[PDB]
Copies of this chain bind each other. A is one copy, B any other.
Amino acid sequence: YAAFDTLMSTAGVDSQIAALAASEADAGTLDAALTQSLQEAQGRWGLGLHHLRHEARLTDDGDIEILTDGRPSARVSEGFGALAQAYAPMQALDERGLSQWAALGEGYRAPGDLPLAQLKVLIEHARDFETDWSAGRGETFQRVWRKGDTLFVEVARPASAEAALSKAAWKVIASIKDRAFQRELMRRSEKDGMLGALLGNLAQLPEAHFTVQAFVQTLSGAAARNAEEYRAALKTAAAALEEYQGVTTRQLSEVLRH
């Protein structure tokens, strides 16, 4: 039970599965809680599998199996690296790291070249619409889509799990006041890299497979159609991304320090 919490902790989703499993809750409630957390985790992982139906259920074998559009991909006790090697073939990333898949599925997708003027009309007067990726604030990207009575905004800053481990390794290496040890790690970083130099291991760690690369902000009802509030969710998602991406680089520095 605690392994799924650490697997859901790499996306900013507090599942409380270890507390819900001990809460003596029925299987119908446990399955719904584990399913609603992996969906909020898949939206923060940047996998771009929104077109897939993510689900989770506990097996009678004493394990938890992941579900994707009907077919089982992997199990919980099979390690955090087995699930990453299962959703990777179902994911298509471009040269920037974004998902080329459309969240709505088969249909039309407006390009990222569309001005903000034509977007307010598709937010106030349209039914179903999906946009591609466009350059956001700073070095980030953003995409929007609306399905049914719910509007979704996914501001993303692509960053792989390996690149995330190398960034946190250079932060703890630069914070070394000992100039002799800081030079020794800088000499080994020229060949093995920033990660292999600080270590002179983390294959079972969940942070080495899934990282935070996007944020999903939702809106339903009449707010999902007002163009003024849509401009307030893109900043609420870009700020929830800077805080989430700023907290994972700090939790990773507390582990590689040893």
Minimal Cβ-Cβ distance residue in B for A120: B118
CA distance A157 to B201 in the complex (A): 34
Q: Using Cβ atoms and an 8 Å threshold, which residues of chain B touch A201? A: 77
Q: Is residue A126 contacting chain B, with contact meaning CB distance below 8 A? A: yes
* Pick from B77, B122, B127: contact of A125, CB under 8 Å: B122
Q: Using Cβ atoms and an 8 Å threshold, which residues of chain B touch A107? A: 127
A108 touches B125 (CB 8 A): yes
* Pick from B63, B121, B128: contact of A127, CB under 8 Å: B128
Which A93-151 residues have a C-beta within 8 angstroms of B? 104, 107-108, 110, 114, 118, 121-122, 125-130
CA distance A85 to B65 in the complex (A): 28
Interface residues of A (CB under 8 A from B): 61-63, 77, 79, 104, 107-108, 110, 114, 118, 121-122, 125-130, 188, 192, 200-201, 203-204, 225
- Given contact pairs A127-B128, A128-B128, enumerate 20 new A-B contacts (beta carbons under 8 Å): A61-B192, A62-B200, A77-B201, A79-B203, A104-B127, A108-B125, A108-B126, A108-B127, A108-B225, A110-B125, A110-B126, A118-B121, A118-B125, A121-B121, A121-B122, A122-B122, A125-B129, A126-B129, A127-B129, A127-B130
